[PDB]
Amino acid sequence: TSLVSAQRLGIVAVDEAIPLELRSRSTEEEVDAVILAVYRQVLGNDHLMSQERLTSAESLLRGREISVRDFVRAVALSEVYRQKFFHSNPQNRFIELNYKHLLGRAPYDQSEIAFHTDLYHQGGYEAEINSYIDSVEYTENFGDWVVPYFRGFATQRNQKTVGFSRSFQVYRGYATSDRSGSRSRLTRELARNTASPVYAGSTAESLRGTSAGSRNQMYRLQVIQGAAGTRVRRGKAEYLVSYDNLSAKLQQINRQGDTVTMISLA
Amino acid sequence: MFDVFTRVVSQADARGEYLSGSQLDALSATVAEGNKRIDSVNRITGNASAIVSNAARALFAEQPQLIQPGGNAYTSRRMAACLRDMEIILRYVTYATFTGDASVLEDRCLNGLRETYVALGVPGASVAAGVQKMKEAALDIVNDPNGITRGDCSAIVAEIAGYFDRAAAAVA
Amino acid sequence: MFDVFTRVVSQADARGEYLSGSQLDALSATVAEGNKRIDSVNRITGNASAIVSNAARALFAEQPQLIQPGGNAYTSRRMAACLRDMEIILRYVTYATFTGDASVLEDRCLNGLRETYVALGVPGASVAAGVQKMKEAALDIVNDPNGITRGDCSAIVAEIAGYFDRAAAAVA
Amino acid sequence: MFDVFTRVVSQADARGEYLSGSQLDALSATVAEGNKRIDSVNRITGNASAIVSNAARALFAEQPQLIQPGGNAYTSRRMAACLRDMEIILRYVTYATFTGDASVLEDRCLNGLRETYVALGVPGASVAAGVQKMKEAALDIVNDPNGITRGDCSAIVAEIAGYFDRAAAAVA
Amino acid sequence: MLGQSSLVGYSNTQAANRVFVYEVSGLRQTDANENSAHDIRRSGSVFIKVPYARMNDEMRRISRLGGTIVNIRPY
Amino acid sequence: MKTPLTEAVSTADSQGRFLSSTELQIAFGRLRQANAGLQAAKALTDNAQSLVNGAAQAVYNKFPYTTQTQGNNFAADQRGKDKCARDIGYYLRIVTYCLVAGGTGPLDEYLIAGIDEINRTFDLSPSWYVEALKYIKANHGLSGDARDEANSYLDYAINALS
Amino acid sequence: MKTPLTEAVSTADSQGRFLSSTELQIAFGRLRQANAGLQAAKALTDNAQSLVNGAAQAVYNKFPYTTQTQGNNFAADQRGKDKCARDIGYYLRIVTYCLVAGGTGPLDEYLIAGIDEINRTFDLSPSWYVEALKYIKANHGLSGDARDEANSYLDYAINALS
Amino acid sequence: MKTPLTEAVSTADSQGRFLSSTELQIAFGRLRQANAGLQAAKALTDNAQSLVNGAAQAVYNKFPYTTQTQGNNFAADQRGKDKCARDIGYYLRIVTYCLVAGGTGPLDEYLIAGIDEINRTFDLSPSWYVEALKYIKANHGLSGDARDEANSYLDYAINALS
Amino acid sequence: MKTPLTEAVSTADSQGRFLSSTELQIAFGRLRQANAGLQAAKALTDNAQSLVNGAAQAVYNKFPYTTQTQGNNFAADQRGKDKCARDIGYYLRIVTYCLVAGGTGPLDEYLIAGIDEINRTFDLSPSWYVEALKYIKANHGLSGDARDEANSYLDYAINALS
Numbered sequence A: 001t002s003l004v005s006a007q008r009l010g011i012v013a014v015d016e017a018i019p020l021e022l023r024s025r026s027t028e029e030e031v032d033a034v035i036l037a038v039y040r041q042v043l044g045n046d047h048l049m050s051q052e053r054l055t056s057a058e059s060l061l062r063g064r065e066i067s068v069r070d071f072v073r074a075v076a077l078s079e080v081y082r083q084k085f086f087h088s089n090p091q092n093r094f095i096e097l098n099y100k101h102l103l104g105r106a107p108y109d110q111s112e113i114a115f116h117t118d119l120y121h122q123g124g125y126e127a128e129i130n131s132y133i134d135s136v137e138y139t140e141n142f143g144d145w146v147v148p149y150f151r152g153f154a155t156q157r158n159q160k161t162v163g164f165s166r167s168f169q170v171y172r173g174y175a176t177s178d179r180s181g182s183r184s185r186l187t188r189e190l191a192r193n194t195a196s197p198v199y200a201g202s203t204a205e206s207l208r209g210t211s212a213g214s215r216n217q218m219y220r221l222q223v224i225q226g227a228a229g230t231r232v233r234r235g236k237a238e239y240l241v242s243y244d245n246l247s248a249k250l251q252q253i254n255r256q257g258d259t260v261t262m263i264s265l266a
Numbered sequence B, C, D: 001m002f003d004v005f006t007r008v009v010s011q012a013d014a015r016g017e018y019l020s021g022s023q024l025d026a027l028s029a030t031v032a033e034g035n036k037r038i039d040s041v042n043r044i045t046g047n048a049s050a051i052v053s054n055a056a057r058a059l060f061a062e063q064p065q066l067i068q069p070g071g072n073a074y075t076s077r078r079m080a081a082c083l084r085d086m087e088i089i090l091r092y093v094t095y096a097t098f099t100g101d102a103s104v105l106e107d108r109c110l111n112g113l114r115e116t117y118v119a120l121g122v123p124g125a126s127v128a129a130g131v132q133k134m135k136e137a138a139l140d141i142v143n144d145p146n147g148i149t150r151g152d153c154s155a156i157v158a159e160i161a162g163y164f165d166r167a168a169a170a171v172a
Numbered sequence E: 001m002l003g004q005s006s007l008v009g010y011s012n013t014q015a016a017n018r019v020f021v022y023e024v025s026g027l028r029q030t031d032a033n034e035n036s037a038h039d040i041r042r043s044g045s046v047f048i049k050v051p052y053a054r055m056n057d058e059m060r061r062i063s064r065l066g067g068t069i070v071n072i073r074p075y
Numbered sequence F, G, H, I: 001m002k003t004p005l006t007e008a009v010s011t012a013d014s015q016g017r018f019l020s021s022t023e024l025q026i027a028f029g030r031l032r033q034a035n036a037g038l039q040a041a042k043a044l045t046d047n048a049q050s051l052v053n054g055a056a057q058a059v060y061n062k063f064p065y066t067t068q069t070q071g072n073n074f075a076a077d078q079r080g081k082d083k084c085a086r087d088i089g090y091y092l093r094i095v096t097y098c099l100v101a102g103g104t105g106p107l108d109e110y111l112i113a114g115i116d117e118i119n120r121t122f123d124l125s126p127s128w129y130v131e132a133l134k135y136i137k138a139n140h141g142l143s144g145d146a147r148d149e150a151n152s153y154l155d156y157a158i159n160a161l162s
């Protein structure tokens, strides 16, 4: 997005990112940069140890034996990818990680969760992973030579609006990685076809004045509430409370049977 | 995931000391229990389709409302997803039985299953009832005495029963 | 790709000795010519749209069969593709002028261009005629004496002319 | 991929016939050599770095032209690439020794290596000589009677020798 | 001609342990790739190494983009 | 095909790794199981004709309509019976291959992959082949490790079928 | 973790499959190896302190300069010697973890991954640790399967460092 | 290679853009630096032999063990000394190439990429080459822009080694 | 946005490397250009109204139809004239921003990206703005590096419009 929304949302680096294309007759440093970009984006910005590097796959990429898409596929099918994104993760979290790493976006629909779940159950991890890389979406956006990059913050064709909002649930910042087993943030949002408010970068903070307590910190409590007292006006509720009233607010939410969806510093 | 051995290893590495003698003898006792563990895994695996189908049939018999039109197991795709969920739960129970540790069952299957069900409207209590049906069906299969060397499999049966209960508790 | 410095560096590393004094002095002469190199690049870039559009107009005035229906430049998509091709060739010629080496032009622009045009049916000879028209316009823009510090720019013009002839020879 | 069992299975399935008594006896003899095969794989793996590094140093001791400037092994990236290739060939030979069948070494490493080395300008004869040096080191280490239940390992050594020759012949 | 180590999936299907080289020509701008973010760099003979299990996909991909499969060779 | 040795190598190659002690233990397990598998395969192929004939007859008895109603997919005529006996022989032969190989790889490679759409295309019910495999389970006469491994492969085919 | 049981379940789960006879043979190999591995771990544990001190002294003997030249990366002072003894103790302790787990998985996760950056940043020669591992391998006093499994882990570390 | 002109063209080509004033300023900075870089390459070349022998001798002084310890990776005999002088000459020659090219491109292309695998495989400690480069930076005797540019390349090599 | 300093850092960051002599030369080129760019921006700022009014008047002279044809996109009435002077002022102000920044980055971020579909949806002829930019080019009265940099931004806008 433009700068004025980008600084607020903390997506300036994503907006100014340039797609990396491995051209013909590329030099050694270009292949090095392409390999580094693939490792950064497919492995979700983890500190990749040299012992976890795919030496044979990057050799084939260097020697023009395979394309960038094939190297992306080799990294995605690698046991390193399995260990940090599949073997200790629930299936819904795993496929949103696949969507972020391979297509650069958040899941659009619960049917996309229904897909890749049956596909896993019928054809294994390899077929399920190949679905993303062989998809029509991967071909027009990245092709055989462009490193995949995150696209959820920009308006795409055949895109649902929720994708942009849901993007901030899967991209938590430039200095973030997908490293810690964790559950998806999009489960209820995808299942019930909703959208969650975006609280990223500086968007989450709210005015404090003299209303915040001793340590001048407000917390936003997003809860799901029903009538258990006073009339409930909305199913969704947001509560801004100081630190000193955080335990009391939590306990009275608990005794009303209200489900807490999120707590963030505001 | 962890197995029965790596679980002790990870705790020891975090504490930064070698496994004590007692931990080594405990793992050795697990080793002496290994053939019966493999037999139980093989027996549940060999009857897995029968286990899932019979448990599902019994579950839909006592809960006609699951398969009633508008019910959560109505329509072919939802019913197929339901049978898939039964099969998935049974498979990770066998994985947990094989490893001697519940991490694969917890991390891959049970983590997030409850709120997935709640979000989607899949009745977790009915899933728990189906898992309980697979429980006794598989425990009779594991404890079947004919065509196997005799011995006490009560400890293995208790462990497999615990995995099934953990699954039943997680989905509800 | 190489530049004027890295070309002799790569040759020296393959030979395995330091750059000789003659090579270092020749690169110093290149540094002396560097201001005129930058000015030429800037002059071609500042008239990039004019060069491409005027050369395309000349290439369609004579040789009218390109823009006649059934011709390779007929329809907006193919015409836009043709204009994009002239701009791309001009852009890579400026790249070669900026670097002082034709490697960027060879590797990233002209590599496979003849095969690409043979497979599309693009009349590569006509592309070469358009490239020559871009060449003459670019050369008289570079050699424009007013509004600039007078000097002998024959060497940089010859280098640019060589790049243009190289693009025309590759496509033909 | 094929191992020693699936190879005869694939041949039998293609003929659509059961394995005869002679084939099963040959497979039984393979099982009787299984401990020696595991020992050979373990010994080469435990000395993999030493085998590759000593062979590479010997390969550059003679044939000095590889490491002179302009040579194929010159510069750090190409030396690292050469070292990497020696280790890769050795790794796939161990895979072939482990499986008892040469399919893994041929299909994943050997087939297409000669043309690849020709296109890069890699000298196939020199890398074949390095493979020969890796052959001699690995066979000495496998045929080391110290610290092992002494026995006749002639058959497994001949198989390893065949795999190394296969690597050397496919790369030259 | 390398590649089979990484192109063939880690699944040990004997059918899947087969890769093939596709020669494709005439990769034009078509209505199928109007919204392609990347641009076509070559329209001449390009070589794509395809494992057996994805040959169904790739040829479809080639066929939507106007590419002509002129030859297919065992690797 | 999926076997202990090849799967160990394939996952080691996926990681660019030499074969560590884990793969050696897998080979040791394969060695422990291999003699029983070879002995089971020999025993199964000795009376393979009797096993296939009895299994075909068991399917005919369990499903009498297969030998009665006309149809390409039924064994009313001799052509159907020859096709049926050939199918049982296919199942039993690939099971012996699985016993030899040490895994369900031959079944997956030659039989399991694509069997359901074959059965749908040619209107063959999987229940027929389940009865045949159940007869093979009940009448092979194997004991010990050989019995358990052969039954695991037979139950694998049954579970894939049903 | 690179251990046979986790490996077997990882392969099956990646394939979305139940544990077949291939995975059972993997467990059988793990069971055939585990007691020797466990008592190798206990033999290494009971002699651990003397082994580490002896390994440290062997490194000091082969590389005498480490005990003389000043520098943070050397063992000239008591602080450096404690760091050296702690490092060799780390090597031995995770090796026992490998013997308990039946694979190189403890070595990979705790020590091997990123060790090159460590030895480069703090200028520690990997050859020192190779010498420590060679002493441990030559002085653990094991035999048979215990020796074979323990030596494989020690040589795995040696190959990783070189 | 990582030189200013090629990087400017690379970043312009990745966006599909003509060269603008930003790229022109890059070339102007390249022109400002090139003459100082070129006499520096000339001065380093003119004094190459003494610098290489002095750097090698400095390494032998700082690490006496390499002078008298038997081993292929050590310079005890003439063979190992020649190799050492050849390596230091490689370092110095590529540094002059970097001065000519105006960037760390030759160091990356010829020396930096893959150096740590070489050092690990042949058991050569990067501390040796760090001291050699330190000698070069202390005794090349350049001043001003030439010294700063030359020191940047030598420090770049030092940082990659450490 | 696109400046020598920011692009140097972004290129270095995408390759995960520290800033080397290449980026230092880029900054040096920026410094050599920056003083002339700043005083060119000052000269354009001081003469902004005369330049904007003269360029707008020049567009009206060369395109008289814009002054008597009725329509939202034309300057026949005062509202159209106000939009036109504001648009040319937008162009001139952003050009001064480019001179300050040392690159076309302000033009790309503020004006160039999306300019074509704005001209299309509001039926604004880019030839009008090209003539305005040509007047600014011919009447800014700058010299030397100031003229060169300022003209590069102006005809960058011209090239983007045509």
Ligand SMILES: *[C@@H](C)[C@H]1/C(=C/c2[nH]c(/C=C3N=C(/C=C4\NC(=O)C(CC)=C4C)C(C)=C\3CCC(=O)O)c(CCC(=O)O)c2C)NC(=O)[C@@H]1C
Residues within 6 Å of the ligand: D032, D033, D034, D035, D036, D037, D038, D039, D040, D042, D142, D143, D144, D145, D146, D148, D149, D150, D151, D152, D153, D156, F021, F024, F025, G033, G144, G145, G146, G148, G149, G152
């Ligand atoms: C040629 C290869 C050399 C050789 C080998 C040899 N080995 C054995 C027997 C055994 N070797 C092992 C191996 C291991 N046990 C472990 O725990 C590990 C680590 C996972 C390994 C690699 C085993 C289990 C045996 C069987 C029991 C025993 O110790 O004897 C033999 C004996 C015959 C046989 O094949 O069983 C032989 C011949 N002997 C030589 O002389 C060659 C140098």
Ligand SMILES: *[C@H](C)[C@H]1/C(=C/c2[nH]c(/C=C3N=C(/C=C4\NC(=O)C(CC)=C4C)C(C)=C\3CCC(=O)O)c(CCC(=O)O)c2C)NC(=O)[C@@H]1C
Residues within 6 Å of the ligand: A001, A002, A003, A004, A005, A006, A153, A154, A155, A156, A159, A160, A161, A164
């Ligand atoms: C115009 C009337 C108002 C206005 C608009 C404005 N919108 C954006 C940015 C975005 N718009 C969308 C919306 C969609 N994208 C889709 O794919 C779909 C269809 C399913 C919709 C509805 C999104 C997601 C964005 C952000 C991503 C993108 O810009 O591509 C902007 C730009 C904001 C910025 O800072 O760049 C603007 C200006 N602004 C106004 O002031 C008008 C009232």
Ligand SMILES: *[C@H](C)[C@H]1/C(=C/c2[nH]c(/C=C3N=C(/C=C4\NC(=O)C(CC)=C4C)C(C)=C\3CCC(=O)O)c(CCC(=O)O)c2C)NC(=O)[C@@H]1C
Residues within 6 Å of the ligand: A045, A046, A047, A048, A174, A175, A176, A177, A179
């Ligand atoms: C060291 C002073 C302290 C410490 C550090 C530590 N960090 C991590 C993990 C990560 N570090 C980052 C940070 C970045 N990655 C980037 O790309 C950027 C640039 C924008 C930054 C700032 C990230 C994202 C991670 C996540 C994991 C990853 O591998 O990338 C760890 C690892 C934790 C773990 O392995 O579980 C550690 C140890 N730890 C200390 O104790 C020091 C105080």
Ligand SMILES: *[C@H](C)[C@H]1/C(=C/c2[nH]c(/C=C3N=C(/C=C4\NC(=O)C(CC)=C4C)C(C)=C\3CCC(=O)O)c(CCC(=O)O)c2C)NC(=O)[C@@H]1C
Residues within 6 Å of the ligand: A090, A091, A092, A113, A114, A117, A118, A120, B066, B071, B072, B073, B077, B078, B079, B081, B082, B083, B085, B086, B088, B108, B109, B110, B113, B116, B120, B122, B123, B126, B127, B130
């Ligand atoms: C059957 C006994 C009950 C039932 C089941 C049912 N489940 C779903 C949907 C999902 N189930 C899961 C769970 C998993 N998928 C996995 O891949 C894993 C293993 C790693 C697990 C644990 C998920 C994620 C979903 C959602 C995605 C999907 O649709 O597959 C449904 C469908 C719900 C819907 O269509 O909205 C059903 C029907 N339903 C009953 O009524 C039974 C009690």
Ligand SMILES: *[C@H](C)[C@H]1/C(=C/c2[nH]c(/C=C3N=C(/C=C4\NC(=O)C(CC)=C4C)C(C)=C\3CCC(=O)O)c(CCC(=O)O)c2C)NC(=O)[C@@H]1C
Residues within 6 Å of the ligand: C066, C071, C072, C073, C077, C078, C079, C081, C082, C083, C085, C086, C088, C108, C109, C110, C113, C116, C120, C122, C123, C126, C127, C130, E027, E028, E029, E039, E040, E041, E042, E043
């Ligand atoms: C114009 C002077 C002549 C002409 C041109 C024309 N070209 C194409 C198509 C392509 N041109 C290229 C070339 C390149 N693309 C790049 O990215 C680069 C850098 C490597 C180059 C040199 C390519 C690849 C194509 C095909 C794909 C694409 O259009 O992007 C066409 C269109 C052909 C068609 O049928 O679509 C045309 C018309 N035609 C003439 O008649 C002129 C003589």
Ligand SMILES: *[C@H](C)[C@H]1/C(=C/c2[nH]c(/C=C3N=C(/C=C4\NC(=O)C(CC)=C4C)C(C)=C\3CCC(=O)O)c(CCC(=O)O)c2C)NC(=O)[C@@H]1C
Residues within 6 Å of the ligand: C032, C033, C034, C035, C036, C038, C039, C040, C042, C142, C143, C144, C145, C148, C149, C150, C151, C152, C153, C156, H021, H024, H025, I033, I144, I145, I146, I148, I149, I152
């Ligand atoms: C050669 C084809 C034509 C020519 C050129 C010429 N130019 C100079 C000198 C300079 N040109 C520049 C250029 C720029 N300064 C800027 O700020 C910009 C934008 C980034 C540019 C393009 C500079 C800095 C100089 C030096 C100072 C000066 O203004 O003179 C010369 C003089 C010799 C030299 O090499 O410097 C020449 C010859 N002159 C012609 O007659 C040709 C038509």
Ligand SMILES: *[C@H](C)[C@H]1/C(=C/c2[nH]c(/C=C3N=C(/C=C4\NC(=O)C(CC)=C4C)C(C)=C\3CCC(=O)O)c(CCC(=O)O)c2C)NC(=O)[C@@H]1C
Residues within 6 Å of the ligand: A055, A056, A057, A058, A059, A060, A062, A063, A064, A065, D066, D071, D072, D073, D077, D078, D079, D081, D082, D083, D085, D086, D088, D108, D109, D113, D116, D120, D122, D123, D126, D127, D130, E002, E003, E005
């Ligand atoms: C060393 C003994 C000889 C030598 C080697 C050398 N090889 C290359 C380049 C490549 N080698 C391969 C081969 C493989 N890569 C793999 O992943 C596998 C398994 C599938 C194999 C067999 C490939 C693909 C390349 C190209 C990619 C790359 O360069 O890394 C080089 C480098 C060539 C160059 O840089 O241009 C070298 C130096 N060279 C000798 O002189 C020895 C005889």
Ligand SMILES: *[C@H](C)[C@H]1/C(=C/c2[nH]c(/C=C3N=C(/C=C4\NC(=O)C(CC)=C4C)C(C)=C\3CCC(=O)O)c(CCC(=O)O)c2C)NC(=O)[C@@H]1C
Residues within 6 Å of the ligand: F059, F060, F063, F066, F067, F072, F073, F074, F075, F076, F079, F080, F081, F083, F084, F085, F087, F088, F090, F091, F110, F111, F118, F122, F124, F128, F129, F132
């Ligand atoms: C016997 C249990 C019942 C039966 C048999 C029957 N089968 C067919 C035809 C086919 N059988 C197969 C099966 C396989 N072919 C293979 O390659 C393998 C795996 C290695 C198997 C298991 C196939 C593919 C066919 C169709 C093609 C062919 O005829 O070969 C028939 C004929 C059906 C038809 O439409 O022609 C029959 C009769 N039918 C009964 O009634 C028995 C109870």
Ligand SMILES: *[C@H](C)[C@H]1/C(=C/c2[nH]c(/C=C3N=C(/C=C4\NC(=O)C(CC)=C4C)C(C)=C\3CCC(=O)O)c(CCC(=O)O)c2C)NC(=O)[C@@H]1C
Residues within 6 Å of the ligand: B032, B033, B034, B035, B036, B038, B039, B040, B042, B142, B143, B144, B145, B148, B149, B150, B151, B152, B153, B156, F033, F036, F144, F145, F146, F148, F149, F152, G021, G024, G025
């Ligand atoms: C416990 C729930 C039931 C039980 C089990 C039991 N099994 C054994 C012993 C063995 N079982 C096996 C298993 C297999 N062999 C194979 O080849 C395969 C298929 C690939 C399998 C699954 C083995 C190898 C043994 C050891 C040899 C033997 O058969 O004796 C025992 C005996 C104790 C032991 O641990 O060895 C027991 C108790 N017995 C029951 O009564 C329960 C119903």
Ligand SMILES: *[C@H](C)[C@H]1/C(=C/c2[nH]c(/C=C3N=C(/C=C4\NC(=O)C(CC)=C4C)C(C)=C\3CCC(=O)O)c(CCC(=O)O)c2C)NC(=O)[C@@H]1C
Residues within 6 Å of the ligand: G059, G060, G063, G066, G067, G072, G073, G074, G075, G076, G079, G080, G081, G083, G084, G085, G087, G088, G090, G110, G111, G115, G118, G122, G124, G128, G129, G132
């Ligand atoms: C002993 C053989 C030689 C030696 C040792 C030495 N090591 C360090 C510092 C570190 N050692 C490690 C290593 C590890 N940490 C771990 O967690 C593990 C995996 C379980 C390993 C292998 C690390 C990370 C450091 C640096 C941080 C720390 O201080 O602990 C030093 C000190 C270096 C310094 O600058 O402080 C020394 C001296 N020195 C010798 O001379 C022996 C030959």
Ligand SMILES: *[C@H](C)[C@H]1/C(=C/c2[nH]c(/C=C3N=C(/C=C4\NC(=O)C(CC)=C4C)C(C)=C\3CCC(=O)O)c(CCC(=O)O)c2C)NC(=O)[C@@H]1C
Residues within 6 Å of the ligand: D057, D060, D067, D073, D074, D075, D076, D079, H059, H060, H063, H066, H067, H072, H073, H074, H075, H076, H079, H080, H081, H083, H084, H085, H087, H088, H090, H110, H111, H118, H122, H124, H128, H129, H132
């Ligand atoms: C000198 C500071 C110390 C030393 C040196 C030494 N080096 C080697 C061997 C090699 N050196 C290299 C390095 C390079 N090769 C290149 O092409 C480049 C980049 C342009 C570099 C930096 C390599 C690759 C080797 C191994 C291959 C070869 O033999 O050339 C040795 C010999 C090692 C051996 O095993 O024979 C030595 C002795 N030794 C000292 O003791 C000094 C302190």
Ligand SMILES: *[C@H](C)[C@H]1/C(=C/c2[nH]c(/C=C3N=C(/C=C4\NC(=O)C(CC)=C4C)C(C)=C\3CCC(=O)O)c(CCC(=O)O)c2C)NC(=O)[C@@H]1C
Residues within 6 Å of the ligand: I059, I060, I063, I066, I067, I072, I073, I074, I075, I076, I079, I080, I081, I083, I084, I085, I087, I088, I090, I091, I110, I111, I118, I122, I124, I128, I129, I132
């Ligand atoms: C003047 C050269 C000619 C002219 C001008 C004219 N412009 C508009 C309308 C718009 N101008 C813009 C342009 C910009 N907005 C920006 O934010 C920037 C970048 C910083 C630019 C360059 C836009 C977006 C509009 C439309 C919205 C608006 O009215 O502001 C009009 C009016 C068109 C209408 O329908 O309202 C006019 C008249 N008209 C002439 O005749 C001159 C030759």
